[PDB]
Each structure stands twice: as structure tokens, then as C-alpha cells.
Amino acid sequence: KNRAARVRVSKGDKPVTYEEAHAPHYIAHRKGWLSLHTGNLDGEDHAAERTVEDVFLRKFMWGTFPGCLADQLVLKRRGNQLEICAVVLRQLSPHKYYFLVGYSETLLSYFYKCPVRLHLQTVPSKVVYKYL
Amino acid sequence: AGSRLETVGSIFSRTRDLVRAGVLKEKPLWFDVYDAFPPLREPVFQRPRVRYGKAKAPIQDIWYHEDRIRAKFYSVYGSGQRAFDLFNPNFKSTCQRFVEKYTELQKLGETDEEKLFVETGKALLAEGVILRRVG
Amino acid sequence: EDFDTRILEVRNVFTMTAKEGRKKSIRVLVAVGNGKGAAGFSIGKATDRMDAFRKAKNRAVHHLHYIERYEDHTIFHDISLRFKRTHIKMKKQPKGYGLRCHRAIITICRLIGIKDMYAKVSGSINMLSLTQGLFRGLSRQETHQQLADKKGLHVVEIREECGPLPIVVASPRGPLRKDPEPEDEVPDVKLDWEDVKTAQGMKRSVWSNLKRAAT
Amino acid sequence: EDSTDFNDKILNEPLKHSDFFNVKELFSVRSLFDARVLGHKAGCRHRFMEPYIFGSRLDHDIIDLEQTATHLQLALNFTAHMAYRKGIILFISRNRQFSYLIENMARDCGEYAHTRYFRGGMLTNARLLFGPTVRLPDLIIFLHTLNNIFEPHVAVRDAAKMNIPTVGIVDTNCNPCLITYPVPGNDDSPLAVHLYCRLFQTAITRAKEKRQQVEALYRLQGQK
RNA sequence: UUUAAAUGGUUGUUUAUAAAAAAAUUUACUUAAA
RNA sequence: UAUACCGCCAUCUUCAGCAAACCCUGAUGAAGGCUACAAAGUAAGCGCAAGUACCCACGUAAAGACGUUAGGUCAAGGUGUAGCCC
Ligand SMILES: [K+]
Ligand SMILES: [Mg+2]
Ligand SMILES: [Mg+2]
Ligand SMILES: [Mg+2]
Ligand SMILES: [Mg+2]
Ligand SMILES: [Mg+2]
Ligand SMILES: [Mg+2]
Ligand SMILES: [Mg+2]
Ligand SMILES: [Mg+2]
Ligand SMILES: [Mg+2]
Ligand SMILES: [Mg+2]
């Protein structure tokens, strides 16, 4: 039996989001890619450095906003710009969100030497696609 | 709440008891009607069992005095040519006409069935009835 | 909220499946009763013990008997019955006697509201049969009123603590018969040897009438 | 203050009369006889139907119509009182010769009919099948109490589980033990089934109109 | 109705609960004096 | 130490079954639940199927549940328990 990135049926009480409810064979049929850059296009360079950056950014944001992220990040690259789109929860105070946005945007711009923006979308609770 | 033990008592006995205990907050709509005009038998579940040994049903065969006449007539003459019309409640068959004449001649005081049977047939023959014997 | 539930048995029954072999299930017997005569029991089955408890508890309330209690503390008369291979012989007792009966009958009695009773369970001590038999007997007990109506005679209670005073506990709602019930010189009744043997002081048991906690 | 008076004048008043709806006039023993209200052969007899059988005429059980009249009077009276009380009446029958007739009779008298295959749990699992707020029938009238394998219709047992009173035409091969208001009679001949439908449709219609008349008089008087 | 077709080391199967809580800010320029 | 596990898989599968929540039958036992001219089952969800990829509605891929073999892997990496620390 295949295992890769499959949430397995339980007793019908496990809430899954739309992203985690779709197995890998749907990545270009029902769900899209969580990162969009040019590295993996034909004749394009630096796929390796883009990949390492994505892995770091996903871990940095998970620990920088502990318990706030409601779903996976969407990493966007346009030219020199890096745009991080995060769906967060409405539990942490707004003051603390603004502090962390100013802190993460500055710290990441100096680390990867590019203009970095963080776009937060707040949800009251995790969006449940189905109960498995 | 209610009680689904349909084999323990009746719906009224169960309902009445639960209302008395306070389990049923409101008695059902039919309760008052049932109590005012109850059925002849309380509907209690009972198991049908096979009759064993000498136990027999009390249903008795329905017979009448004129059945003896009808049996003899049917044997002598058979089923009348006139077809029985069971839709008409007042329909009289040839056999019924014979029974009536037979009974009328019994009131006259004839004591012999064979003689009385012969006299009955002769009266019908005179009235124009067709009596073709099996022979 | 008036009804209280109490477990009677929890068993780990098993079946065999082609894919997994032994498949463990839980069989749970529970009894529900408000303490005012209304009490029932049900069997709940589920893989998880919590699901079995819930199913039995919720289903038992839809299968409630009503038990006729004499003076709301005991049974109207002595009931002897056999359900399958289980014999239950219950005896009516005076106030202050307590529940001198099999632990399961004690639990069911508290749910029904019976305070004083004695019962001896013989034969198979199956918990399913005992419960089903206990509810069968208590449901079928005839009240003093039902007796008066059927017999068309007064039911007169004679109490030793009240001397010869005749206490009429029930009278026939309809017409009262004027002929006295025929007094058979010798009653052709089936006597339990265990009762007769005790009345004659022939029963020595080191386990009978042992001091026990208040029930 | 007003509810108790309303209830007494309307709900409790009819219960003080032996025949408030005058269902006696709807039928006679002669009318029942002319509709062939004739049992099955003696070999098909149910033991519990023997008290209602007049006798066997050449091995054909004859139902005693003198008992039918008393049983039918009680059944029609109970049906009228339930229709007067705005009770949901459900007609159940699995005889496919009369499914069309019975379904029309129910629609005409503003009641309900179930002449189709009875699915398991319609009554005992209704809140799951229909919805948590579904209201079950207050009366169930069985025009045929046997299913199509000559066994008691499952709804007879289930109606008793739900404490729903049942009226039923019980032929000589039927089991009347759980039917609240059994009416011993022929359930096969069209003439008989057509009479039952006319009698129960009239009693329900009359009762509903009487409820409207009594309510109207109470209201007109209340104002003035 | 109709060829022959023996074997597989020992012991190892199923009961008691479940589950956190928060936080302060406290709406309105410039200046200036002694 | 894969006989503590996550992760990723083999295998039946060139399968169609696994089913929570209820209802009913067995006298309220382990359990069982169908007959269409129908007789107690209703069933969310999962798989199959349907859709999608490739050159079609075909074919091939992909997919393939719950479980079975304490099946493979502490040597992809991570990690519970035990052990080493000149
Ligand atoms: K390890
Ligand atoms: Mg594979
Ligand atoms: Mg019939
Ligand atoms: Mg050997
Ligand atoms: Mg071996
Ligand atoms: Mg392994
Ligand atoms: Mg190995
Ligand atoms: Mg295809
Ligand atoms: Mg393949
Ligand atoms: Mg498929
Ligand atoms: Mg291994």
C-alpha cells in the first residue's frame, strides 16, 4: 500500500484541510503547488538553491509563529521579490502579529539579500474540508 | 419516554403505568379516548400453541334440517339446469323450491320421507318445473 | 435526570474473522431505574467500552417495566420462578429487613425502589438470565387490589405487631361476594423442601444469617 | 384561565357520550351480510380467531356478524374520536388488488396511506429515517393485517412497540392478539373491502367536520 | 462409478476513565513661558 | 533492539470490501439482518466506481480502503528503551 503524504481514514472524527486531504497523484489535477518559482522550468538554473530556501522558510515560519499557522505556506517569487502568504489564526493579539511581521520581513531580507514581504490572512478556525 | 416491551401487557397498561410513575410527562392523545371507550379484549400478546392429544377446536359444522332434503335432491336429480345466481340475495334455486314444497307437504302431516319426497317431485312437475333425473 | 444507570456485567466476547482472526467485542448489561418503580435493562455491544456503555444505557430507557411495590418498600407476595436454568425465590419481608439478596438483585432493587426483600438464586447463576428472570417475576406480581377485584372479597391483613386488629388493605371495587371462599381442609400446594427444612430447624449452614454491611 | 374551559367544552365534551358521532347509523348487520363480511377454509383457521367464528359451513369458516357489529362499532367510534382530536391516521395494507383504492380513500379524507413494501424501521427508527422532529401516526388502521407471505404485517408489532393504537380487519387466518380494536370480517372480497373504506372514510370526514362546527360555535359565543 | 498422494519441534492473545489558561493600551496639533 | 516506532514500501490487489451512528431478530447468548408479484433493515464516511494524465468514450498508466505476513528497512533521516564517553 502507498503511504506518501496520505492522511488515513479514521472513525470520521479527524478534521483535514483541503491540502492534506489530497494524495500526491492530485498535485496537478485538484491541488496546486505550494511554491511557484522558475527554477524547475526547462533551461532554468538554481533549482537547488531555491529548494533549500523553501525548506528553511517553512521551518522558520513554523517556529516564529508557533501555534498560529492554520495551513501550509504559499511561497511566491517574482523577479527579486519573495512573498510569503500565510493563513494564520485569530488567537494571538494583533500587536504581536505586527511585531512578528516587521521582525520576520527584516530578518529574512538580510538573510537572503532580497525584498521579502509577509502577507497574513486570518481565519477564525482551521478550515475543515472533510472529516476522515 | 415510552416502553417498547410490546409483549409485556398492553399499550394502555404500559402507558398508564408510566404516566403514573411520572416517566411520561404528557399522556398520549389516544389515552383519554381509549379509557372512555375501551375494546372488549385488552390487547395483550399471547403465544399460539399447537393443540396436542385430545384437544379439539370448538368450531361446529353448520347444518340444517333441510340439508337432508338437499342432499337427497342433488343425488336424485343433480345440479339444476338453472345456474345459481349468488349475486341476487333473494335467488331461489330448483333445489330450494323443492325444499319449500317438501316443507309445505311436511306441514300437511306426511310422515314418510320417501312418500313425501315422491309427492314433492310430483307437485313441482305439475307446476311446469323440468326435473330430469340422472337416470 | 431522574433515572440512574448501574452496570451489571461487562464481558469480552470474541468472534473469528477471516482477515483478522479474533475480533474482540464488549457485551455490557446495564440497568436503569428512577427509584419509583420504573426500571429497565438492556444489552449494549461495541468494540469500544465507552460505546457499549452508551448504547446499553440509552436503549434500556426505552424498555422500562413498572414494578408494583407494596407500601413502596417491598413486593406484594412471595414470587418463585424459573427463567431457563435460573431459579429465583423471592420472599416478602417487613420494613427494616434490608436487601438480603444476590448483589445484582440488590443493585436492581435499589433502582426499582424495593427496600426490604430476601431472595435466593439457585441453578445457573447467569447474569443475563437472573436479570431477565427478576424483571419477569416482579412484573407479574398481583397486587392486593387486583386480588380483591378478582375474588370479590376483602383482603384483610393480620399483623403480629398489631394483635388481632383486622386491617383491610383492599376491597372489591365492584360487588362484594356473599359466599365465603371454600376452606380446603388440607391445601394441595407444592412446598419447597428448603422452606420446610428450615422451619423444622433441620438446616445448619455456617454461611446463612452472617453479619453483613447495611444494604 | 381560558384554556381549561376550551379543553372542557371541546376535548372532554365528546368523551361523555356513548356515540357522539352517531356511527351506529353507518352500518347494519344486513349491510355487512350483503358485503360478504365469509372466512377462509377451516384448515387456514388461526387459533385466536375461534371466539369470533360462528361455525364452519362445509369447511368454510363463517364469521359471526353479531360480534363484528359490536367490534366495528367500537372501532369506528375510536377512529372518529381520533379524527376529531386531529390525530394522524395511517392506513396500512399490503393487498395489491386494493392498493389503489386505499390510497385514494386516504387522500380523499385528508389522511395517510401506506400500501407499499414496509421498510424496516419506519416506526421504530423514524427519527433517523424522516428527521428528529417527525410526528408519528396517532392511529393505524390495518385493512389487511397479513403481509404477502400470509404472516402478520410487521407494522402490527412495531405499532405496539411505539404504543400506537391499531384498528384492524382480522380474517379467520389472522392473529388479533396485538390489534387494539380488532374487527372480525372478510378482508378478501372487494365488496367487503369497499365497505370498510366507505365506513372509515365517512367516520373520519364526519368527525373532522364536527370539530370545525364545535370550534366555530365556541368562538362565536366567546366574542359575544 | 474409477491410480498413488506421507510429514510439520517448545512456550508465546485483548481492560478501566477522559479532558489547560490568558493580555494591556486607555481618542483629538504647534508652540512657548518663567 | 525493524519484536518499541515515525517515515517510505512489499504482499493478497490480475481483490471489493471496511463501515461509525441507529433500528430489529435470537425468550435481551456468542451472533444474525435477504426474497421486487419483496418477508427488517436505514446507513454518513473510506475503497471500488466516476473523473483526470497519455493519442478517443478504447487501451495503458495512475489509483487501489480496512486488514493479513510482529513481512522489508535503527545503515535515507528522525526517534523510544538499553549501552559506550582515554
Ligand atoms: K534507535
Ligand atoms: Mg505498488
Ligand atoms: Mg382473508
Ligand atoms: Mg515422522
Ligand atoms: Mg504443528
Ligand atoms: Mg516489521
Ligand atoms: Mg532482518
Ligand atoms: Mg479510461
Ligand atoms: Mg499500476
Ligand atoms: Mg479508480
Ligand atoms: Mg521481522
From Swiss-Prot, chain A:
One of its GO terms (cellular component) is mitochondrial inner membrane. It is found in: Mitochondrion. The keyword Iron does not apply. Its main location: mitochondrion. The keyword Signal does not apply. Keywords: Mitochondrion, Ribonucleoprotein, Ribosomal protein, Transit peptide. One of its GO terms (biological process) is mitochondrial translation. One of its GO terms (molecular function) is RNA binding. Component of the mitochondrial small ribosomal subunit (mt-SSU). Mature mammalian 55S mitochondrial ribosomes consist of a small (28S) and a large (39S) subunit. The 28S small subunit contains a 12S ribosomal RNA (12S mt-rRNA) and 30 different proteins. The 39S large subunit contains a 16S rRNA (16S mt-rRNA), a copy of mitochondrial valine transfer RNA (mt-tRNA(Val)), which plays an integral structural role, and 52 different proteins. Belongs to the universal ribosomal protein uS3 family. This is Small ribosomal subunit protein uS3m. The gene is MRPS24.
From Swiss-Prot, chain B:
Transmembrane segments: none annotated. Belongs to the mitochondrion-specific ribosomal protein mS23 family. This is Small ribosomal subunit protein mS23. Its main location: mitochondrion. GO terms for cellular component: mitochondrial inner membrane; mitochondrial small ribosomal subunit; mitochondrion; nuclear membrane. One of its GO terms (molecular function) is RNA binding. The modification N6-acetyllysine is found at K101. It comes from Homo sapiens. One of its GO terms (biological process) is mitochondrial translation. The keyword Acetylation applies. Component of the mitochondrial small ribosomal subunit (mt-SSU). Mature mammalian 55S mitochondrial ribosomes consist of a small (28S) and a large (39S) subunit. The 28S small subunit contains a 12S ribosomal RNA (12S mt-rRNA) and 30 different proteins. The 39S large subunit contains a 16S rRNA (16S mt-rRNA), a copy of mitochondrial valine transfer RNA (mt-tRNA(Val)), which plays an integral structural role, and 52 different proteins. The lineage of its organism: Eukaryota, Metazoa, Chordata, Craniata, Vertebrata. Keywords: Acetylation, Disease variant, Mitochondrion, Primary mitochondrial disease, Ribonucleoprotein, Ribosomal protein. It is linked to Combined oxidative phosphorylation deficiency 46: An autosomal recessive disorder characterized by childhood-onset mitochondrial respiratory chain complex deficiencies, particularly complexes I and IV, and hepatic disease. The modification N-acetylalanine is found at A1. It is found in: Mitochondrion.
Swiss-Prot record, chain C:
Residues 3-67 form the S5 DRBM domain. The keyword Ribosomal protein applies. It is found in: Mitochondrion. The chain holds residues 216 to 430 of 430 of the full protein. Coiled coil: none annotated. One of its GO terms (molecular function) is structural constituent of ribosome. GO terms for cellular component: mitochondrial inner membrane; mitochondrial small ribosomal subunit; mitochondrion. Component of the mitochondrial small ribosomal subunit (mt-SSU). Mature mammalian 55S mitochondrial ribosomes consist of a small (28S) and a large (39S) subunit. The 28S small subunit contains a 12S ribosomal RNA (12S mt-rRNA) and 30 different proteins. The 39S large subunit contains a 16S rRNA (16S mt-rRNA), a copy of mitochondrial valine transfer RNA (mt-tRNA(Val)), which plays an integral structural role, and 52 different proteins. Belongs to the universal ribosomal protein uS5 family. Keywords: Mitochondrion, Ribonucleoprotein, Ribosomal protein. It comes from Homo sapiens (Human). GO terms for biological process: mitochondrial translation; translation. Its main location: mitochondrion. This is Small ribosomal subunit protein uS5m.
Curated annotation (Swiss-Prot), chain D:
Its main location: mitochondrion. Changing R57C: In COXPD36; results in impaired assembly of the small mitoribosomal subunit and impaired mitochondrial translation in patient cells. It is found in: Mitochondrion. One of its GO terms (biological process) is mitochondrial ribosome assembly. It comes from the Eukaryota. GO terms for molecular function: structural constituent of ribosome. GO terms for cellular component: mitochondrial inner membrane; mitochondrial matrix; mitochondrial small ribosomal subunit; mitochondrion. Changing D61N: In COXPD36; results in impaired assembly of the small mitoribosomal subunit and impaired mitochondrial translation in patient cells. Keywords: Disease variant, Mitochondrion, Primary mitochondrial disease, Ribonucleoprotein, Ribosomal protein. It is linked to Combined oxidative phosphorylation deficiency 36: An autosomal recessive, multisystem disease resulting from deficiencies of mitochondrial respiratory enzyme complexes and mitochondrial dysfunction. Clinical manifestations include sensorineural hearing impairment, mild developmental delay, hypoglycemia, and intellectual disability. Required for mitoribosome formation and stability, and mitochondrial translation. Belongs to the universal ribosomal protein uS2 family. This is Small ribosomal subunit protein uS2m. It comes from Homo sapiens. The chain holds residues 53 to 277 of 296 of the full protein.
